[PDB]
Structures are given as structure tokens and as C-alpha cells.
RNA sequence: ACAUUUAACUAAAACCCCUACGCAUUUAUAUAGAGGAGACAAGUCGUAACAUGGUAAGUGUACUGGAAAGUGCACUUGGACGAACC
């Protein structure tokens, strides 16, 4: 998270690859020499590219710093590209009541619907002996509620010496969805 | 609706009406189904309250929500503010 704003007269790094306001490459210069050009022409320096190992800073007028972000405000509006995926977690118990399982199963539908990743964990019920046969039958029982909407990303594993099972769900991908749709029609319509 | 008749040298005889009660009305029981409260017990999800209970609590009202509840507006103390200046 950054913004196209002036860095000020406090530079952390001694050597900077300074750039002119008109786009000319002034070349690497000492940190002190950078501030002299900020006063001689009353200009503010903005870090254009952080990624490069050599520091890159461009000195431009305040009006030029307004037009720049005014364009980053349109490019993102025109073509927004926010793809981070949130991860949600649930920790159930083998002996979880159905009423609580329908409440937690409806919460997974809201997350899936928001393209989130739902990590579900199941643990042995309080002083209850149970294997992994019916302890893994809760995932299939939750996934069934979301037939086409959801699919496994990971699969059940013995996270803690078998006393727990962990799975991760995701919203079905567009292509996968279309494939599911196609299959659904054949079973009923063709018959 | 219904009618003064016979009789009368002692005096008597004769008498006999038709309409109501209902698909009205009162109350209660029984029955499909739905839903409360309580006892027993203390499974499931949380942790709402009691300590400034971890966002002080509560009243009334409104909206909202798996659930205790949450929030807004006004009100209360059945909260507090540490009690000389500095
Ligand atoms: K409260
Ligand atoms: Mg509490
Ligand atoms: Mg509280
Ligand atoms: Mg209140
Ligand atoms: Mg709310």
C-alpha cells in the first residue's frame, strides 16, 4: 500500500538514481545533492519504482503529482485487479449438533459465495471415541449442501496424529462450473 | 277465538275453546393441526450477566440477528471517577 506522494527532504538511502521532471536521467548522485535540486527549482521528489535495487526517485512539480494519481484513480476504476483471497477457519467437533452444523454450514455458503477459502477442521468430541470413517463424513455432508458452488481444494489429512482432520474448500472455478452444468443436463434431459 | 239457554202449583237442569319448539337459542364437550410454560437432566454452539465481567448495567421504544443478544434515541443509578492545593 503506497501512494504517489512526495517523500520529503528526508531520504533513507545515500545513493539515489535521480530522474528529471521532464524524464531525463540525471544519474546516480549523493543524497545531499538531491536536496539542492529540490530548492534550486522548487520541486518535490517521488519514488517511481521501489522494486529496482538501485533507488529510483523522480522530481516533479506538485501539479504533476496530482495528474499522476488522478490517472491511477481511473486505471483501477477502468480495470481493477484486486485478487487477494481471504482464508476462513472453522473448528468443529465430531459430536456437533445438527442445528449448529446447519448454522455453520450456512456460514460457509456466504464465504464461498465471496470467493473465500474455507479451512475446516474437525476434532474428537469431548470424551468421545470415534474413528476417521464418520469423522470425515462431515465434510462430504457439508459439501453436499453446495454441490456445484463448492469443491475441495485440499483433502482430509491427519494434522495432529489423527485426532484432527483438516480440509480446505473453494468456490468452483468458472470452467469447472460450466463442466458441472453440462453434466447435469445430460442426466435428466437426454434420458 | 267465545256465548243466556230451558224452566219456574216445593224447585231445578244444562256448560267442557284453538294455538308453541325452530337450519331458533345458550353453554360445554370431543376431534385434525399449530404453539406456549414448567419439571427431569445438564448433550450442542457460543459466552449475554455477576469484578469497571473484559464495550458499566438496566427501563421504554424501534430496527436487526443462529442464539444468548447488538445498535440508535431519550431516561434512571439499583456504576464509578480515587474526593486540600499542586
Ligand atoms: K452487555
Ligand atoms: Mg461477558
Ligand atoms: Mg459488559
Ligand atoms: Mg442499552
Ligand atoms: Mg447491527
From Swiss-Prot:
Its main location: mitochondrion. GO terms for biological process: mitochondrial translational initiation; ribosome disassembly. The keyword NADP does not apply. This is Translation initiation factor IF-3, mitochondrial. GO terms for molecular function: ribosomal small subunit binding; ribosome binding; translation factor activity, RNA binding; translation initiation factor activity. It comes from Homo sapiens. It is found in: Mitochondrion. The keyword Acetylation does not apply. IF-3 binds to the 28S ribosomal subunit and shifts the equilibrium between 55S ribosomes and their 39S and 28S subunits in favor of the free subunits, thus enhancing the availability of 28S subunits on which protein synthesis initiation begins.
Amino acid at each position: 500500500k503506497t501512494a504517489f506522494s512526495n517523500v520529503g527532504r528526508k531520504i533513507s538511502q545515500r545513493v539515489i538514481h535521480l530522474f528529471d521532471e521532464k524524464g531525463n536521467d540525471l544519474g546516480n548522485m549523493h543524497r545531499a545533492n538531491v536536496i539542492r535540486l529540490m530548492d534550486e527549482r522548487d520541486l518535490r521528489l517521488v519514488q517511481r519504482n521501489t522494486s529496482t535495487e538501485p533507488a529510483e526517485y523522480q522530481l516533479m512539480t506538485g501539479l504533476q503529482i496530482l495528474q499522476e494519481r488522478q490517472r491511477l484513480r481511473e486505471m483501477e476504476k477502468a480495470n481493477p485487479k484486486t485478487g487477494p483471497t481471504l482464508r476462513k477457519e472453522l473448528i468443529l467437533s465430531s459430536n456437533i449438533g445438527q442445528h449448529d452444523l446447519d448454522t455453520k454450514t450456512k456460514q460457509i455458503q456466504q464465504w464461498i459465495k465471496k470467493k473465500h477459502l474455507v479451512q475446516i477442521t474437525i476434532k474428537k468430541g469431548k470424551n468421545v471415541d470415534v474413528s476417521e470413517n464418520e469423522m470425515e463424513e462431515i465434510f462430504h455432508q457439508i459439501l453436499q449442501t453446495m454441490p456445484g458452488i463448492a469443491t475441495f481444494s485440499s483433502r482430509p489429512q491427519a494434522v495432529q496424529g489423527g485426532k484432527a482432520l483438516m480440509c480446505v474448500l473453494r468456490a468452483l472455478s468458472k470452467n469447472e462450473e460450466k463442466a458441472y452444468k453440462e453434466t447435469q443436463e445430460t442426466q435428466e434431459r437426454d434420458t
